[PDB]
Amino acid sequence: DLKWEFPRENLEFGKVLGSGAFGKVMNATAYGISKTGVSIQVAVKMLKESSEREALMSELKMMTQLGSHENIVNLLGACTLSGPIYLIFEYCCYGDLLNYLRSKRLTFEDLLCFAYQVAKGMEFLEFKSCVHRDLAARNVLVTHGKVVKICDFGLARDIMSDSNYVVRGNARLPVKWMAPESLFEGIYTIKSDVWSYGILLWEIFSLGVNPYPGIPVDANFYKLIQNGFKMDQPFYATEEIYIIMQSCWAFDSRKRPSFPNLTSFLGCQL
Ligand SMILES: CC(C)(C)c1cc(NC(=O)Nc2ccc(-c3cn4c(n3)sc3cc(OCCN5CCOCC5)ccc34)cc2)no1
């Protein structure tokens, strides 16, 4: 974090766009930011009113080195001096993809376009050797165009409140989005996020349905995944797309396809 420091006085807060237990994300008007253009809309990541502060700091350290990508929420600046730590991001108008799709409850191409950009964005993370711990529809944002951006509501989401996060250790985790090796062996590779992508792929073509509908997370649930159980075809998906999901749902971690291949898989469908 060398040149990313932005004046806190040139920042004008607005309404809160989602608050966690210890942190919040708000809308803001930034003066003198891009071309020093008329003040634009930005997303500011912050903490609500100590040990947790360091968690946000490393998140900022990650952004500056990861570089800017079209399908990843871009870092525009930061405020680390004289006050609470601020993280200025690119503002997304339509919010998360999860709430955006149930709101729809737009063509089939747009569903493919979303998945393509997500897989293309994930490729950029694999190239940088980075593993997304919570890849889902609730962690991807949509902007003014047909483009989607990958993000992480760490400290931004009250994981205690969301039903998706179940207690299986000393912290909640998205069970229905995790790979088998992560479930019982706690192994997290980039091919584990491929599994998460498959689950993500489902809720995209199932329009924001919770995965494994009707069936809750219990002692029985873990046994199905261990038995190689996979989900049925979503309603708005075609046959070719479903084969990608079950490929991402291969029990053997090696068998799952690389995100590079996924970029090429969905791309050919234009
Ligand atoms: C993923 C990666 C790179 C590994 C990573 C992420 C990370 N850490 C993060 O990415 N943190 C993070 C958290 C939130 C945002 C964020 C949220 N929102 C925006 N950016 S824009 C926006 C707009 C919203 O809607 C407001 C009103 N709605 C508008 C549209 O209509 C309905 C209402 C709601 C939330 C929201 C960005 C980054 N650290 O590493």
Numbering used by the authors: 600 to 648, 652 to 707, 783 to 947
The authors write:
FMS-like tyrosine kinase 3 (FLT3) is a receptor tyrosine kinase that is expressed in both normal and malignant lympho-hematopoietic cells and is important for immune response and stem cell proliferation. The characteristic domain organization of these receptors includes an extracellular module, a transmembrane (TM) helix, and an intracellular module that consists of a juxtamembrane (JM) segment, a kinase domain with a kinase insert region, and a C-terminal tail. The deregulated activation of FLT3 due to mutation or overexpression is linked to the progression of acute myeloid leukemia (AML) and is associated with poor prognosis. Chemical optimization of these compounds led to the discovery of quizartinib or AC220, which exhibits both selectivity for and potency against FLT3.
The DFG motif adopts a “DFG-out” conformation, the activation loop is folded back onto the kinase domain to mimic peptide substrate binding, and Glu 661 on the αC helix forms a salt bridge with Lys 644 in the active site. The pocket includes Met 664 and Met 665 on the αC helix, Ile 674 in the N lobe, Leu 802 in the C lobe, and Ile 827, which is immediately N terminal to the DFG motif. The carbonyl group of the urea forms hydrogen bond interactions with the backbone nitrogen of Cys 828. Further, the nitrogens in the urea moiety form hydrogen bond interactions with Glu 661 in the αC helix. The central para-substituted phenyl ring on quizartinib makes key interactions in the kinase active site of FLT3. The juxtamembrane segment, however, is not observed in our structure, and would not be compatible with quizartinib in the active site of FLT3.
